[PDB]
A and B are shown apart, each in its own frame.
Chain A
Amino acid sequence: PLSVFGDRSTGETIRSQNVMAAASIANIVKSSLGPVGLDKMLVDDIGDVTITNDGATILKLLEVEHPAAKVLCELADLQDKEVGDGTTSVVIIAAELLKNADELVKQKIHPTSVISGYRLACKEAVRYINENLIVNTDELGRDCLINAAKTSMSSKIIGINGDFFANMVVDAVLAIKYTDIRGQPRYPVNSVNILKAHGRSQMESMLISGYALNCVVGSQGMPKRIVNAKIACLDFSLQKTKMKLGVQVVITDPEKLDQIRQRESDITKERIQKILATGANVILTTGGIDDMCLKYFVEAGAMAVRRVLKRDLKRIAKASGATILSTLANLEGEETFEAAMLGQAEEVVQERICDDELILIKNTKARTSASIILRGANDFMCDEMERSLHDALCVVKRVLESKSVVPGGGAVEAALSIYLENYATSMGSREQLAIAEFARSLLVIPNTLAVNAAQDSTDLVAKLRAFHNEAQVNPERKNLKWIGLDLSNGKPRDNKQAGVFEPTIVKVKSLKFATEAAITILRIDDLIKLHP
């Protein structure tokens, strides 16, 4: 009777199908959660291999057909973009929320009541986290940043290497620190250039007190080391001058051809001489350099690097104090270059890294920058180290921006579950059930953590819940809020004492995003799939 060219699913069928898709996506990455988690090795059916633990990478690499599962995949991508950590936790929480909400719906509870209860539970969980489960980093110091970095790098290929990698990440983050207007210290991550190269062990990874360029000098005649560098950053190619489309050369007197041809290169020669007359030693350009200008720079005993990436050039200019020059033209209509446009650095060296060479700009003046050279055993391990390092850098940035941290190891989840189970009894009659199921769904994180360690999940979570219930009931034993999970021995442990920390923004954003994803999926009770 509908006569719609397609397939239609209505009622419990489509809801169960959506829950199945979400649960399958959750189960894909549920085995890579927590320090006792293990990585996955993906194959791109063309021989490409990717070994990773990051949830966002796993969900982006996979091709997904069901749209409710695409919702969770792009939810993980959003969590990665806006926070940088907690990518698997948000997916797992959203799937568990959807599963319990579908159970409520199948129990003839209207989805609107479930959604209202979920909204109330999310709001109250955020409020409780902000008011009871935050530790200021002011009284902790650098140890807080070190512990946050170590916690972030757990469950990663640089886990035991954390004692060194946390120091490296903290130094790299603090190097690029700057304050904008309103006196707000903003830490601009992604300005730390991450260079990878297989070779020596992970302990041999070097943190550059400057900038590292993945490019070499254009000519072998130029020196490979300049002590007192005067960096000149350019945004135009240094080649033979060629007239534009609107200009055409027509010769009627044959005597002018030689002069025309000579000027065609003398223009660039004069530009090079003007640039070099100010004492410039290192010349960096985003465009290309032909052999003629390369020889000009060779004769002057100066650096010259072509095809420099735009972001690298911008970072180098900002750090060294140089100014990007897309053209040589002052406000007088002339063509001049002055020494005020030159950046300075304490040393520029072309170093050798495992049969390949790269340029190191060491100790830029007027601004401090940083870069990290990751040494590994092969390409895949270097890629995984880069991803884990990016996660750690994002975590450190979040901790330094907002000075609130939360206990790790599922302590927050258990405290929230206990508080919300207590709180649900004071609101409604069916939204009561929705909030109770939200509280129960929040328990999936410690359960997964315990399961991944081959520990007795039931007993450990029961003990954690008992500790948090005692903390919430007794007002003279509030120090038990920090009791989390110690997966090394499978016992409850004060994670704040043990130094297991996460940024509060991670938990807050994960909860909000998971709640919206669950609400979005739960609103569907019918599906029409048109035939292509």
Chain B
Amino acid sequence: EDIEFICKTIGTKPVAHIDQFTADMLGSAELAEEVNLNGSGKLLKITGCASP
């Protein structure tokens, strides 16, 4: 259910077969990191995207 949101945000295009997995279907991002919330959990954040 989150594929549409992820593709709209990052700019990636889903790949269903390795034949079509090319560079132009990737979404460039400035930073992708996992941050811990002071011991209350871990959050994966992707901040900064070309053509957001």
Whether A and B touch (Cβ < 8 Å) is answered with yes
Interfacial residues, chain A to chain B (CB-CB below 8 A): 78, 81-82
Chain B interface main SS type: loop
Residues of A within 8 A of B39 (CB): 81-82
Interfacial residues, chain B to chain A (CB-CB below 8 A): 38-40
Q: How many angstroms from the CA of A81 to the CA of B38 in the assembled complex?
A: 8
Residues of B within 8 A of A78 (CB): 40
Q: How many angstroms from the CA of A78 to the CA of B38 in the assembled complex?
A: 11
Q: How many angstroms from the CA of A82 to the CA of B39 in the assembled complex?
A: 6
Residues of B within 8 A of A81 (CB): 39-40
Q: What would be 6 A-B contacts, judged by CB atoms less than 8 Å apart?
A: A78-B40, A81-B39, A81-B40, A82-B38, A82-B39, A82-B40
Residues of A within 8 A of B40 (CB): 78, 81-82
Q: How many angstroms from the CA of A82 to the CA of B37 in the assembled complex?
A: 9
Q: How many angstroms from the CA of A81 to the CA of B40 in the assembled complex?
A: 7
Output the nearest chain B residue to A190 by Cβ-Cβ distance: B39
Closest CB in chain B relative to A406 CB, distance in Å: 19
Closest CB in chain B relative to A242 CB, distance in Å: 29
Closest CB in chain B relative to A75 CB, distance in Å: 13
Closest CB in chain A relative to B19 CB, distance in Å: 21
Residues of B within 8 A of A82 (CB): 38-40
Output the nearest chain B residue to A189 by Cβ-Cβ distance: B39
Closest CB in chain B relative to A519 CB, distance in Å: 20
Output the nearest chain A residue to B37 by Cβ-Cβ distance: A82
Output the nearest chain B residue to A505 by Cβ-Cβ distance: B38
Q: How many angstroms from the CA of A78 to the CA of B39 in the assembled complex?
A: 10
Closest CB in chain A relative to B36 CB, distance in Å: 11
Q: How many angstroms from the CA of A82 to the CA of B40 in the assembled complex?
A: 7
Closest CB in chain A relative to B43 CB, distance in Å: 15
The list of the 6 closest CB pairs from A to B, nearest first, reads A82-B38, A81-B39, A82-B39, A81-B40, A82-B40, A78-B40
Output the nearest chain A residue to B41 by Cβ-Cβ distance: A81
Closest CB in chain A relative to B41 CB, distance in Å: 9
